[PDB]
Amino acid sequence: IYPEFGTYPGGGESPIIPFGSEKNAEREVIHGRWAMLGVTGAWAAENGTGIPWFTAGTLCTPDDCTAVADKFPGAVAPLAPEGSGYPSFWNVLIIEIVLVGAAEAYRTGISDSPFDDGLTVGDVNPGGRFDPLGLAESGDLEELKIKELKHCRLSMFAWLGCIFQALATQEGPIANWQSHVADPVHSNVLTNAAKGFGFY
Amino acid sequence: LAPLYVLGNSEQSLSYLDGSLPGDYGFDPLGLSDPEGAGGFVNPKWLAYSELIHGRWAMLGVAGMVAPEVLGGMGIIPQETGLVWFKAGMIPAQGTYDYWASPFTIFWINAFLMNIAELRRAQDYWNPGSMGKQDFAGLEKMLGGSGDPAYPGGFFNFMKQGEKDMAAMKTKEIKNGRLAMMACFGCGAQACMTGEGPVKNLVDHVIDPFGHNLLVNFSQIGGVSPF
Amino acid sequence: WSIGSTENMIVCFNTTAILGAMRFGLMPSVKKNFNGASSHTAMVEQANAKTIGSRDPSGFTAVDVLAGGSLATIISAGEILAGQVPY
Amino acid sequence: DLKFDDDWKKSNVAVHLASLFGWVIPSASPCPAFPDNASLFKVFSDRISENLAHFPTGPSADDPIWLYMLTWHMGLFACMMFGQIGVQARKQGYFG
Ligand code: CLA
Ligand SMILES: CC(/C=C/C=C(C)/C=C/[C@@]12O[C@]1(C)C[C@@H](O)CC2(C)C)=C\C=C\C=C(C)\C=C\C=C(C)\C=C\[C@@]12O[C@]1(C)C[C@@H](O)CC2(C)C
Ligand SMILES: CC1=C[C@H](O)CC(C)(C)[C@H]1/C=C/C(C)=C/C=C/C(C)=C/C=C/C=C(C)/C=C/C=C(\C)CCC1=C(C)C[C@H](O)CC1(C)C
Ligand SMILES: CC1=C[C@H](O)CC(C)(C)[C@H]1/C=C/C(C)=C/C=C/C(C)=C/C=C/C=C(C)/C=C/C=C(\C)CCC1=C(C)C[C@H](O)CC1(C)C
Ligand SMILES: CC1=C(/C=C/C(C)=C/C=C/C(C)=C/C=C/C=C(C)/C=C/C=C(C)/C=C/C2=C(C)CCCC2(C)C)C(C)(C)CCC1
């Protein structure tokens, strides 16, 4: 259901853009799960540490990646020994791209499917293996599907936000949010347009 | 059939709690009201009757906690008479008032008055119709009872109120008795902790909920200690 | 101590994790545990405690809540009091 | 049948190695109770070295080697006994 605006892929069509390829539905949902994780990560990283997500791109560089050690709120220990440099960027990126590429190739059937029970390639939400808690079978899986997709679109809008705010304010989404909640009259996009977004 | 009432019911509890008993919501997590294996003071009739007596006594008790304090604070009753519940002569070390007689004389008076009331009530509980038979100074006519020890429709119902919907009213009183038992539990509890009377604890929570609640009161668990 | 402090967050995380675990069958619960089970890897539904009274669609009970909260408080005590010992 | 089984021991090399080394390694791990975060195996080996210099002379009655020996051998033998029990029970139908 979409009383707010638009509709879901199963029924109806967007007047703003024709449906086109089907696989856009699959593409949209995965994009949204990713933006959910990205926005939440931006939110929580800048909540605990304070640094914006976009600046946090340089959180690890081939010369400087041991900086990340113990950069987590309340973390029991640092990620790696402090000042060792053993948490090199080369290592952490290699491990990352290995685990991601394996997950994505198993997702899309590039390589194989290690699990032998269904798990059809090309589905948003199989739920054989990727539902350990049984909340889909518990009920309202379809309601949860609409809920999922709406959270997807909201989070992609939020991520497009966080990108835009970075491009204009250069301050970070939570810092912008705190500034807006403190004095909403004089902390908005248009007063930043009046200052000229820095570039003007 | 509501939240916080399915918590207690189970196969055992629902086996005997049919629902016709006043304010029966099935909440019997323990096997206390099981008719089979019943005996002594853990038989279902005694428990139901004792719940009702406790509820009525708690309603009277909470009303006597709130009324003297509120009425003194506003000024309806004298300030010397508008003492908090636990400083009105219940505990002389905590506090006492100079009544007409000595606080222990009053204790003995109220003791035998409660003896003569409660033993009659008990004999109605055990032998229902027997309380209207023996010549109790010509007052047995209005103390016959009703066959239900919980609800004697004699003198005590002299207004004849709550007759059009007696079942609904029966439930009203059980629920109010439960609420008043919890209320009196609380009033004692935050009289032991806070050291003030229940109305003052109330208004303190109304004004500053985040500075006059339980967790803050842990630091000040005696207020001013009178011992 | 305050809301958001390390001890408060430890105990809140512990109770959330424990209650979720025994709500979704990851920890032994009132309605599903190792009583009359087969091996270490599989718990079984307890017919004696089956339908003991709940309004939660997985059958989560008040005793489940009390048990999870007690165990969570126990674990939070153990973890927090580590580092408070004098030595 | 009712005849005694001469393979009652069921001595498994993998059990022997697993128990020995899976006690040695944890007992060789850092222990902040001991000085310099030394392990139980570390301090025990230190006492063995110190007493092996005087090979005929035994360790003094007050020397810490005895407590380290007891507190290491208990854990070792616990690993040996429980490892045999668990392996032979898993092989059998005790667990699954
Ligand atoms: C200290 C050593 C130790 C202990 C406690 C355990 C414990 C366990 N193993 Mg074993 N195991 C060990 C070493 C040990 N393992 C080693 C070295 C190997 C390799 C040879 C194995 C191989 C093995 C297999 C193959 C299997 C097990 C399994 C099990 C579990 C089932 C019950 C059992 O057999 O033990 C009884 C254990 C208890 C904890 C019960 C209570 C005992 C009380 C508390 C007294 C114990 C005192 C304690 C050990 C302290 C010792 C110090 C001493 C000074 C007193 C249990 C968690 C089985 C399982 O299901 O695991 C998944 C299984 O299939 N184990
Ligand atoms: C809270 C209470 C009883 C609580 C019982 C509970 C929760 C029982 C719960 C369970 O059983 C169920 C439901 C279901 C079971 O399966 C499970 C359990 C869990 C076992 C009674 C209070 C009972 C409270 C009572 C009786 C209050 C009495 C007050 C009186 C008499 C008067 C006092 C005064 O006269 C003085 C002393 C001095 C004067 O100045 C002032 C006044 C206040 C006027
Ligand atoms: C966690 C975190 C912390 C670190 O510190 C830094 C870090 C970088 C690592 C970071 C991680 C980041 C990650 C993983 C991000 C993932 C992002 C993703 C996948 C975003 C998706 C963005 C999606 C967009 C734009 C879509 C726009 C589409 C639009 C408007 C049109 C929509 C639309 C449609 C089709 C039909 C309607 O009817 C009408 C209209 C036309 C409106
Ligand atoms: C699959 C599965 C199977 C099991 O059986 C059961 C199961 C439950 C575990 C289940 C698993 C589920 C999972 C893993 C769910 C993950 C959920 C997640 C990570 C949700 C995050 C949702 C986040 C959103 C929408 C963000 C909104 C963002 C907004 C408004 C921004 C606002 C904003 C802007 C842009 C500008 C300001 O300056 C700053 C701020 C930031 C304030
Ligand atoms: C989701 C949901 C919800 C929510 C839920 C929740 C949130 C719950 C919670 C719950 C909880 C949160 C609970 C808790 C509990 C607790 C407990 C039960 C505790 C205990 C404790 C103890 C027992 C202790 C002991 C001790 C002491 C005293 C001292 C010493 C030490 C120790 C620790 C041992 C609702 C309903 C809205 C709706 C539905 C869904």
Side-chain angles (χ1 to χ4, degrees):
Chain A
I1 64 178
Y2 269 89
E4 304 93 353
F5 189 69
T7 206
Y8 56 91
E13 51 285 31
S14 40
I16 302 332
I17 188 83
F19 203 93
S21 296
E22 191 297 359
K23 182 174 280 223
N24 287 353
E26 203 33 61
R27 233 178 295 278
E28 180 179 316
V29 173
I30 299 287
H31 270 56
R33 295 168 180 189
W34 272 113
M36 250 171 296
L37 285 181
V39 155
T40 290
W43 199 346
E46 175 165 80
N47 229 14
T49 77
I51 39 181
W53 55 275
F54 45 96
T55 74
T58 75
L59 175 61
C60 268
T61 59
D63 57 324
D64 311 328
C65 173
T66 172
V68 188
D70 222 352
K71 297 199 78 192
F72 279 99
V76 185
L79 284 307
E82 53 175 2
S84 61
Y86 199 93
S88 34
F89 175 99
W90 296 119
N91 189 335
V92 306
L93 176 56
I94 275 283
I95 297 207
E96 165 193 355
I97 190 58
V98 157
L99 298 202
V100 171
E104 298 262 300
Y106 295 153
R107 170 165 145 281
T108 65
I110 290 184
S111 181
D112 225 339
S113 181
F115 315 105
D116 54 353
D117 41 42
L119 287 185
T120 165
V121 165
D123 225 341
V124 280
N125 33 61
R129 184 61 60 151
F130 300 116
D131 193 327
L133 300 189
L135 210 66
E137 61 78 16
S138 81
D140 56 271
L141 160 72
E142 284 56 46
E143 293 177 350
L144 282 160
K145 275 146 48 162
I146 306 315
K147 289 172 172 184
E148 171 143 46
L149 186 48
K150 270 202 275 199
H151 279 109
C152 295
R153 301 189 174 165
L154 181 84
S155 73
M156 293 138 53
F157 212 90
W159 188 252
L160 180 52
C162 303
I163 298 173
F164 264 110
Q165 306 180 189
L167 296 171
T169 59
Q170 285 147 88
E171 211 196 350
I174 278 150
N176 299 322
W177 185 87
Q178 286 167 331
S179 149
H180 176 75
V181 165
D183 294 321
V185 179
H186 308 272
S187 315
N188 44 67
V189 52
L190 309 93
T191 196
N192 299 10
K195 97 189 182 158
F197 297 149
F199 312 120
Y200 296 68
Chain B
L1 199 62
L4 282 318
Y5 283 146
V6 299
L7 266 59
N9 59 37
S10 61
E11 287 79 3
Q12 187 185 16
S13 170
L14 293 168
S15 65
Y16 46 81
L17 295 177
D18 292 22
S20 188
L21 191 68
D24 180 347
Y25 299 91
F27 192 90
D28 190 13
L30 314 177
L32 295 152
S33 287
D34 205 68
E36 63 86 24
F41 289 128
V42 181
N43 51 78
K45 281 173 56 270
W46 177 269
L47 278 71
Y49 187 52
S50 183
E51 190 173 344
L52 186 44
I53 298 300
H54 271 83
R56 292 166 173 168
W57 277 123
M59 277 172 331
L60 296 186
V62 70
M65 288 178 188
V66 187
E69 223 188 10
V70 159
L71 292 185
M74 78 162 106
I76 304 302
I77 45 169
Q79 291 63 336
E80 92 287 347
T81 70
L83 300 172
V84 306
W85 67 275
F86 56 97
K87 300 203 196 74
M90 184 181 78
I91 313 183
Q94 190 62 218
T96 184
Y97 173 121
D98 205 34
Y99 300 102
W100 63 281
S102 164
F104 274 83
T105 281
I106 289 192
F107 150 70
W108 165 247
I109 290 169
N110 304 163
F112 73 72
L113 273 304
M114 290 302 292
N115 206 65
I116 180 53
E118 292 269 313
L119 294 174
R120 300 268 296 181
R121 179 176 70 71
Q123 284 293 72
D124 186 272
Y125 169 72
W126 288 312
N127 212 10
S130 94
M131 278 282 99
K133 313 197 147 74
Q134 193 162 340
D135 205 320
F136 179 61
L139 293 172
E140 70 279 350
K141 281 88 182 180
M142 59 200 35
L143 288 170
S146 152
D148 218 330
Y151 309 103
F155 174 119
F156 308 102
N157 195 359
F158 58 103
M159 316 308 243
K160 282 111 181 45
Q161 213 72 310
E163 208 59 9
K164 59 188 189 296
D165 57 358
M166 179 60 123
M169 275 271 310
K170 257 202 190 66
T171 301
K172 286 316 186 283
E173 172 210 36
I174 272 296
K175 298 179 82 165
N176 279 261
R178 294 165 184 181
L179 182 61
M181 278 172 308
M182 310 319 284
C184 279
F185 194 8
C187 284
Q190 70 246 31
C192 291
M193 159 148 294
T194 73
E196 286 162 359
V199 180
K200 295 341 182 56
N201 305 114
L202 181 63
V203 296
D204 274 345
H205 190 65
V206 192
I207 305 293
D208 193 15
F210 287 100
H212 290 97
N213 51 19
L214 172 45
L215 306 188
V216 174
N217 281 335
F218 285 150
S219 290
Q220 74 262 12
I221 194 152
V224 176
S225 292
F227 298 89
Chain C
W1 180 93
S2 196
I3 280 173
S5 61
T6 205
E7 294 172 347
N8 169 251
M9 206 46 230
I10 281 167
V11 59
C12 285
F13 177 73
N14 289 357
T15 188
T16 302
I18 285 190
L19 288 193
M22 84 186 37
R23 200 267 189 195
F24 298 101
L26 306 178
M27 292 177 72
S29 82
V30 174
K31 302 206 174 183
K32 185 185 169 195
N33 54 39
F34 289 106
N35 270 310
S38 188
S39 49
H40 298 65
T41 68
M43 315 176 307
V44 288
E45 313 288 335
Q46 305 303 308
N48 65 282
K50 197 166 109 213
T51 64
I52 206 174
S54 171
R55 190 59 64 78
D56 194 9
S58 66
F60 209 59
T61 63
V63 168
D64 271 319
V65 172
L66 287 185
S70 293
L71 185 62
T73 310
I74 285 178
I75 295 174
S76 315
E79 298 175 352
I80 290 160
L81 296 174
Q84 298 196 356
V85 295
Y87 286 141
Chain D
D1 213 347
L2 294 179
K3 310 294 300 216
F4 184 80
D5 200 273
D6 285 326
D7 206 49
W8 71 274
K9 297 175 180 177
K10 283 163 171 44
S11 308
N12 188 226
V13 166
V15 157
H16 165 51
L17 301 177
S19 71
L20 162 70
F21 278 121
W23 170 251
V24 165
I25 270 59
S27 77
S29 319
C31 174
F34 283 126
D36 284 358
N37 307 251
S39 79
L40 175 57
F41 183 80
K42 182 64 176 68
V43 299
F44 184 34
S45 297
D46 267 39
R47 285 332 298 157
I48 295 160
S49 305
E50 265 86 71
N51 298 134
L52 272 174
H54 301 282
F55 155 72
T57 280
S60 49
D62 184 1
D63 157 41
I65 195 169
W66 305 123
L67 178 55
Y68 301 152
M69 194 187 299
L70 276 291
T71 54
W72 197 78
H73 278 86
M74 294 190 320
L76 169 78
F77 302 150
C79 283
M80 293 201 322
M81 211 202 60
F82 279 97
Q84 178 79 347
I85 287 162
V87 168
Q88 299 299 337
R90 189 52 152 258
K91 177 135 50 173
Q92 297 171 49
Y94 286 89
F95 308 140

